């Protein structure tokens, strides 16, 4: 009917390969500018990070089949169990339901974390869907993101200390850090600022992992090693 | 030498066929419940509708290459010009940037339309991407959505009149309307409720179209006929 | 400055999910008619089957990264190792190179198997590509095809015996076999035709597997059990 | 049933955008070597070209919904009408049925064109599927291929004349031709070899077009201009 209904023929199938892990990853859009305009503390800002996590919790509570989420900096990844058929496994549905629910929550709960700082404008989020064929590839993905958190936090902590405390210019801080190794960065934090990196808050060092324990609770533990997985076998062991 | 970086190989290309119209369509998620919980007026609620449009305007102003938007009820469609290469024409990018920016705006500008009614929880939105190969198919798509607005508004107007004014039960209203034709519904509104359907507000009857005139201005005109397109030839005539 | 070159923009990416098994499966097109027209012996014809295998061998020798092939009746499946990047893993390339090389070989080597029977016309082949995320799914796929060979050979052997030896009409044969179980079919072959099914040629019962031993050698063994895989661990154990 | 049947869930949809032109293009695989080994005459070999065309005719006769084919050098393109639903418009089916039927025919009819030259080995063919959204884009595609034929034949004719008649070395011929314009190449053919390019056989200059007139007949006419299309309006005018 309608005579215009034929246009439905143009919708294409975007089904995610069956019995595989489906991950939706979100990145705040132009959050470098968003951070500036909202006076985000460098190198880490607890308000921003906890707001993100609160949004991830909401996504996990409102959508379905998400078994684990991992967030750090301006990103959050959501893993849907592989036997899911939530929306016939259509990529577009995973993407938009996660992206929209997250964004609405970001604004909705903003005041709970930024009681004094006013939200200047509704932000946007970049999103993508990736399918991982195995438990090992999924874990490697999560390790990839956690390792990224580590690399960036170490760099940023020493970088901002050089600026905010040593008085160096952004360009000077960068030059001093170029070519430096992990051990070097640690030595600089210790010698020049009397900072023990390993004592920095767990959230800033490892990021945040959300799992069902029922409600999604936050943890700032290592997920690269086996310990985490051996202790929460229900996640990867699930059927299909 | 990351070692986990190989997981990048899993990202798949979701490029939209070149030189074609790209449409992102959004639908409020479970908005039947959202409407109930927020006391939306039936059959039409100006607050809700105008908030949606405000969101569409924000999406058009913050993203790029959107030449026309059309909304009605709990939906809104965004048309990206066919020569766009905004994000290498990746479907996921169109989807998430539109969905997220729309959702954050929905919460952000809520009070501007629901000054008294409080927002009980951050809503989610359903989204999809469709590629239309020609100007005629794109027009037919828009006509399909506008015709949908007409069909539903006529049905809902008489439906809610039977309930809110005749005292019929939802089930009775439905029974009375089954098998009825468009002319019949019009007759019922006129005879039993002294309602001239054609005099109902334009926004409720035709929905809202957004085009650049620069800023995106709202119009509640017919877009099925040629009149609209002959008057705004810049939209379909653009290169590529 | 060609001016027509822009049509290249329309080519779409059809890359197969990285680090996964890629299978190309071929089916002779309308081979029921081809078999009739070329006097194929029923229920099995060694000429046809061995010609197919010869073709599979040529596909494995001329293309690259194929680690195992399995054929039966009018089909043949080719498995490409998962670390292959042969053609950027484009589905179309796997499909056409396999399909074309197979078809040309079918005609080229025809006389080597049908020395007297003349080829009446060049046949066509149906083809498809499927990506299997794991070793178990790939094995289950091969088992699915071998089991198919078993089910059909048992059915066809008793079916053609009822016709070619009992004088039943095709429709009568079918009626007699409807509702029958595997054991029943075995009983019928034994009692009424003095045929011990398990003694039928291995090729007809299990089909043909091709693996590198270098050249691709034919084997008519079971591949559903673990025996085959434990003995040829190089196939599934390969990197990536 | 089967227990292995679940593997069917892995097959992905590869449907071509509805109501659009579907083109399957084939390129002989490593035909530079094939030409050498079979003593193909340079710059053009009538046997090779006519064999290709014979194969294209067979593809058009055995498959369905192909309305026009265009071939030149070692390639052939097949255009399927846009309202086709032959195989649910699955790319893989267009690809493999065209590639296989073509290849089997190439071998089958080889002797009809190479009566003395023996076929040393069964060749392979590269294949691809492209979807064109409009009549204009389809025509531009065909013009792109015909123009390519022109460009290459002009270059090759003068190139091989320089070698085969002027005694230049391949590397010298190339150097002399670098930087030369169309008019220059024409001047060289005329002045040095007394060759009027425009008098070369139509097949070598324009290639071959196949259309239904019913059977697919060969034509060596221009298809870049409107003349051809105005005279055979049935092709682009067909419904959908």
UniProtKB/Swiss-Prot annotation, chains A, B, C, D:
Keyword Transferase appears in the UniProt entry: yes
Compartment annotation: Cytoplasm; Mitochondrion outer membrane
List of residues binding Mg(2+) 1: 27-28, 74
Amino-acid positions noted as binding GTP in the UniProt annotation, renumbered to this chain: 27-32, 73-74
Record annotation: effect of changing residue 150 to A: Loss of enzyme activity
Manner of cofactor binding, per the entry note: Binds 2 magnesium ions per subunit.
Gene Ontology MF term list: ATP binding; GTP binding; guanyl-nucleotide exchange factor activity; identical protein binding; magnesium ion binding; nucleotidyltransferase activity; tRNA binding; tRNA guanylyltransferase activity
Catalysis performed (reactions): a 5'-end ribonucleotide-tRNA(His) + GTP + ATP + H2O = a 5'-end phospho-guanosine-ribonucleotide-tRNA(His) + AMP + 2 diphosphate + H(+)
Binding site for Mg(2+) 2: 27, 74
Entry-linked InterPro entries: Thg1_C_dom (IPR025845), tRNAHis_GuaTrfase_cat (IPR024956), tRNAHis_GuaTrfase_Thg1 (IPR007537), tRNAHis_GuaTrfase_Thg1_sf (IPR038469)
GO biological process, one term: protein homotetramerization
Effect upon mutating residue 74 to A: Loss of enzyme activity
Result after altering residue 196 to A: Loss of enzyme activity
Outcome after substituting residue 27 to A: Reduces activity by 99.5%
The keyword Protein transport appears for this protein: no
EC top class named in words: transferase
GO cellular component, one term: cytosol
Reported effect, residue 75 to A: Reduces activity by 95%
Subunit structure: Homotetramer. Interacts with MFN1 and MFN2; functions as a guanyl-nucleotide exchange factor/GEF for MFN2 and also probably MFN1.
Reported disease: Spinocerebellar ataxia, autosomal recessive, 28: A form of spinocerebellar ataxia, a clinically and genetically heterogeneous group of cerebellar disorders due to degeneration of the cerebellum with variable involvement of the brainstem and spinal cord. SCAR28 patients manifest mild motor developmental delay, gait ataxia, and dysarthria. Some patients show mildly impaired intellectual development. Disease onset is in early childhood.
Family matches, as PANTHER family: TRNA(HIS) GUANYLYLTRANSFERASE-RELATED
Function summary: Adds a GMP to the 5'-end of tRNA(His) after transcription and RNase P cleavage. This step is essential for proper recognition of the tRNA and for the fidelity of protein synthesis. Also functions as a guanyl-nucleotide exchange factor/GEF for the MFN1 and MFN2 mitofusins thereby regulating mitochondrial fusion. By regulating both mitochondrial dynamics and bioenergetic function, it contributes to cell survival following oxidative stress.
Family: Belongs to the tRNA(His) guanylyltransferase family.
Protein name as catalogued: Probable tRNA(His) guanylyltransferase
Record organism: Homo sapiens (Human)
UniProt lineage: Eukaryota, Metazoa, Chordata, Craniata, Vertebrata
This protein's encoding gene: THG1L
């Amino acid at each position: 009917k309608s005579k215009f209904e034929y246009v439905r023929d143009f919708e294409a199938d975007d089904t995610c390969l069956a019995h595989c892990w489906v991950v939706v990853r979100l990145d705040g859009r132009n959050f470098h500018r968003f951070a500036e305009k909202h006076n985000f503390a460098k190198p880490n800002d607890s308000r921003a990070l906890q707001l993100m996590t609160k949004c991830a919790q909401t996504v996990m509570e409102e959508l379905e089949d998400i078994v684990i989420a991992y967030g750090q900096s301006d990103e959050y990844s959501f893993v849907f169990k592989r036997k899911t058929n939530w929306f016939k496994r259509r990529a577009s549905k995973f993407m938009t339901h996660v992206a929209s629910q997250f964004a609405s929550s970001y604004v909705f709960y903003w005041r709970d974390y930024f009681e004094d700082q006013p939200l200047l404008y509704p932000p946007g989020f970049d999103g993508r869907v990736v399918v991982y064929p195995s438990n090992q590839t999924l874990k490697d993905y999560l390790s990839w993101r956690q390792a990224d958190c580590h690399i960036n936090n170490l760099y940023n902590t020493v970088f901002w200390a050089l600026i905010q405390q040593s008085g160096l210019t952004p360009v000077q801080a960068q030059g001093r850090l170029q070519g430096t190794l992990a051990a070097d960065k640690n030595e600089i934090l210790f010698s020049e600022f009397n900072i023990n990196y390993n004592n920095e808050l767990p959230m800033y060092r490892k990021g945040t992992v959300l799992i069902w324990q029922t409600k999604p609770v936050p943890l700032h533990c290592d997920i690269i090693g086996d310990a985490f997985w051996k202790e929460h076998p229900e996640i990867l062991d699930e059927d299909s």
